[PDB]
Symmetry: C3
Subunit: 222 residues, 3 copies
């Protein structure tokens, strides 16, 4: 079942990528870079999840299964999602690349701490986990503070679309660390099959759903 679910994920990711490629042919004022980012995210995620389906993207550490291919996915897909969010705030204005790369740096660190926490035992696990949550909070502060102020400087219609996408992404993103802590990597209150289903469903809303909402809004401003 675990294998079949991952094949299904990969096929959905492929269809998402094709959809964004079709939209790119009639761009409606959205620069090509934002279509390219929307295509890379699901293609990369699809390839990582395919490695899990084929039994390669996981190993047995102590008496637990580490799905290490999820970290390979997120270290590329999550910074690209933050870049898409930042470019949405900056649509029709000057780019602030310093703020964009600040988000990328926080995000890569967050994903690495999660990988190290998964390989850790005892208190050390929760030190790494905690550093990642701090990174996520600073990301949320930037998202609803300075980045939202840039979106307001680009006008009411853009600011409203930005706010909608920021809330959408922020809602997903708090679920990941929560699921991690409850599942076998953390306190073990939730079963492996439950965690697998969450980390199949959530990524569909994050790696394809976010880009549908984000690009449709920007296209409607044309």
């Amino acid at each position: 079942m675990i294998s079949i679910l991952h094949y299904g994920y990969s096929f959905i990711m492929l269809l998402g990528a094709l959809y964004f490629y079709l939209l790119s042919k009639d761009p409606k004022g959205v620069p090509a870079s934002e279509y390219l980012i929307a295509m890379v995210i699901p293609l990369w995620s699809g390839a990582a999840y395919l490695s899990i389906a084929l039994g390669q993207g996981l190993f047995q550490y102590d008496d637990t299964t580490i799905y290490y291919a999820r970290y390979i996915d997120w270290v590329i897909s999550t910074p690209l999602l933050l870049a898409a969010l930042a470019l949405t705030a900056m649509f029709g204005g000057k780019k602030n690349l310093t703020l964009l790369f600040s988000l990328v740096a926080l995000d890569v660190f967050m994903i690495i701490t999660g990988f190290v926490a998964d390989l850790s035992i005892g208190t050390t696990k929760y030190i790494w986990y905690s550093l990642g949550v701090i990174a996520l909070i600073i990301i949320l502060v930037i998202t609803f503070g300075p980045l939202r102020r840039i979106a307001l400087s680009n006008g009411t219609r853009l600011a409203r679309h930005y706010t909608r996408v920021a809330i959408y992404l922020s809602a997903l993103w708090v679920c990941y660390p929560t699921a991690w802590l409850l599942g076998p990597s953390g306190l073990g209150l939730a079963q492996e099959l439950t965690e697998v289903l969450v980390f199949i469903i959530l990524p569909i809303f994050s790696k394809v759903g976010f880009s549908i909402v984000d690009l449709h809004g920007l296209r409607k401003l044309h």
Copy 2:
């Protein structure tokens, strides 16, 4: 023999890099970035191949030359960047198209590494994903990228077409040799594959940049 060949490769790479550095001192209207790219490719490839000569860049009942993937994950995207900048010479840069090629190429090299560590059908799933990536790269090279080269004039377009055909020919040889050699069907022997992955890279890591830079320098007059 395998060790000596790799030392020889590294020394050739060093001479190629020195040559490009000398050309950079009299640039003839070619931006410094294009000389830098031409220097990094052989120096990185040389260092990877040196690790094979010294017995470090491989592990073992099949021998995986993993240092080749370390080489290509840096050297192949830089070759596509040099090709893309050749098309765009004298005109507006399209960095979205350039980064699309880098992304496809890095993916292609990673699939090859995973295919080499894989057994049975799984090997050929990964191999196949890499071939699809390579086909999209060739479509971009002869389609949209060639259209940008045409928009920059007949002389540039002719040089672009020549270097594109040159690189496109090398590049189909790599996956073909991989499949026939010990990583794939095993029809060809280890020593044969070693010689192919010594000779081909000399044409790709030094030869391509001689052809590419000489053409661009000739457009100065």
Copy 3:
């Protein structure tokens, strides 16, 4: 003792990062990018050294301890320090990103050769070490040659600050390969505890000290 020293390092790195964040709030004509770089260097170094304190960032290779977390640190922190130096030379003028990325490329290669030398045995160790020293010499040539000429083109006051920070960084940087060769990774003349102290103290002068000197100088040019 080795663990406690690494915890102390990490806490100092955190305080350095907070200091640079505070300076950023009143930037005095220094672009945001230079404050961001000054913050990333100690935060990254802190996290790497924390992994050593917790017993994760090292392993036993035969009869030696490899502190591999140091290379994870330097592969990010050292190119960012060269970027800060290059941006100091280019302050008030056109950026030369080709020269900046030439320094990044040399530096990443230098750190990789060090990691491979540490995993190597016998003559092979000293081949890799040597390639890294050649990279470091080319970096020093660029620093005192073309990069210093760019600093001169941006005025006497900038050029004087550039020269001061370049000498500061150049002194630190020759110490790293010297300590490496004398310690357990090389000739083994110095003991593990000695090398650990050097690779706690030097990084404090490089990962926080450099950025205090560099940013204070640039902020003084606003007045």
